[PDB]
Each structure stands twice: as structure tokens, then as C-alpha cells.
């Protein structure tokens, strides 16, 4: 299924995912596509930061949902 991931600075990433994929796996896919390390990714859906060991299905994230990607900055 297709979901959309949008950053605070406007950029929208399209991802092919499965409901049973963990948030950790989604973060891995974002690294594979965009080069952003998982430890710098905060994924947000329904007003809440998503936890790595949970799945898309745990959060009732369905086809064509949009997640927000908030980035930590290494200084």
C-alpha cells in the first residue's frame, strides 16, 4: 500500500509499505530512499510520535495516509 511522508520544510516522500510493517521498518525504508538515518527520524500520525516496535496497523494507518517526518539534527 502507498503512504505519504511529509517533512516540515515541505518535501513529500511516497513509500510502498504493508500494514504489518513496524515503524522501525518504515524508518529503514526512508533511509533507503532518502539517506536519513533512522535515529534522526521522528514519525508523526494523528498528533502523536510513532514508536519503533509498533506497526502501521497498530496505529490504524491505512492506504494513502500521510505521516509527518520531523528530523533531529546532529550538532
Amino acid at each position: 500500500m502507498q503512504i505519504f511522508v511529509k517533512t516540515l520544510t515541505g518535501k513529500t516522500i511516497t513509500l510502498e509499505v504493508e500494514p504489518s510493517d513496524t515503524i522501525e521498518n518504515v524508518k529503514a525504508k526512508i533511509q533507503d530512499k532518502e539517506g536519513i538515518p533512522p535515529d534522526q527520524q521522528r514519525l508523526i500520525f494523528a498528533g502523536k510520535q510513532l514508536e519503533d516496535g509498533r506497526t502501521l496497523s497498530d496505529y490504524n494507518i491505512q492506504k494513502e495516509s500521510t505521516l509527518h517526518l520531523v528530523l533531529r539534527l546532529r550538532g
Binding site: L8, T9, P37, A46, Q49, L73, R74, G75
Partner: protein
Amino acid sequence: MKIVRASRDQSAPVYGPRAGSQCMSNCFTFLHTCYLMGIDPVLDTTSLDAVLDSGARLDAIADEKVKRQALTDHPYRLGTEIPTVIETPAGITGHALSRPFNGTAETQDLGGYKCLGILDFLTYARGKPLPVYIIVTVGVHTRGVIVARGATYVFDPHTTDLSAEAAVYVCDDFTEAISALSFFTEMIGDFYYDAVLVYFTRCRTTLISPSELLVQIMDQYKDPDIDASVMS
């Protein structure tokens, strides 16, 4: 706006192999020293040089933990990678970090997850009991920010067009503070920050566990903005 300068910046070869990369630890050491001493004593060249010296030491400690834990092999740091007990000639502090603050120039509400614009963030900070201590990163460059009743202090351990050396920029208003965070130029469109408030306590000695410290600081402040999820 007024400026108080060290005699060098963080890239000085005296600071070791990691000269340049220790910015975040220099910022923690700045905030630590101001919490302990008050702001006035820290605002001279001698004291700012001492901050840089202590920051290099803290960074070295942080660097070893990252390697030992395999926290990452990236050379730059996240706040949670900095030791929460910091010890210098000024004394010993423990700290706890706030929940994440992130944003652009303007506030975005992501379905109830508030990402405050930089002005709204400083304004939020100013509603807490003053002074408030902040670690703020823009790009790769970390600064220390203190929001106090009559001024906002921005410590930058790296060179700017206004100062070759590390300096504290004494700002009469948030417009000046944000200018300092913006490298004194116009970057409204590209602006993005990652910030944590730092909640300090004075410690009598260094013999307290990281978990004990977090709980103690949570009880001291009773402020929901302290990030409890850090607990391990």
C-alpha cells in the same frame, strides 16, 4: 546587541582531533556554568575560554560513550548523547532534557503535534520560570540560548561575521536572538531548528546514577515538558 568574545573559537588546534565537532558540548558547558555562577561572571574572555576548555573535555567523554555503546558512528552529537552530570571548576550540575522542539520560521500544527516556529518557541520558553536554558541546533551548528528577564543570551562556539572567536551575543529582543541563530543573514525560507530546554540542578557530588538524577529533576520542577521517555 552587544558581544562578549573568547580568545579563540572551537576549531582552534589546541582542542584536539575533534576540534570543530564539539560544539554541542561547548554549549552545554556554557549553560552549566551560567546556571552555577549566574550569567555575569561567565561574560568575559577568561571565562569563555574556560567554557571551551571544559566543553572539549565533555565532548571527549561523550565521544567515548558513543563508541563504547555504538550509539552511532556519526561525528556530530544529539542532546541525549551528552552526559547528564557535568563537572567543572564552577561546580557540578545534573540536567534533564525537555521533549523535542522542532520547527521552521512559522508554527505548524500537525494534527495536534505542535511544531512551533522559532519566535513562538522562544516565546513559549519565556513563559517558564526564568531564566530558561536551551540547546538549539540550526543546520549542523549548535548554540546555547538563555532566555532571561531582561535579555536573551546566545552563545556561539563558532566564528561569525561579527566575531572570529566564540562569543556570547547579548540580545535585547528575540528578533536579535533569531538573527544570531540565523547566522546574521536572511534565511527565512530554509530555517529549521531542533531544540531542547535543559533543566538543571546543583549536585553536591558526581555520585548519582543517570536514572536517579532524571527522577530527582522531574520531582524538582514538576513540569510535563521534561522528557520521561529518556528513562532506562
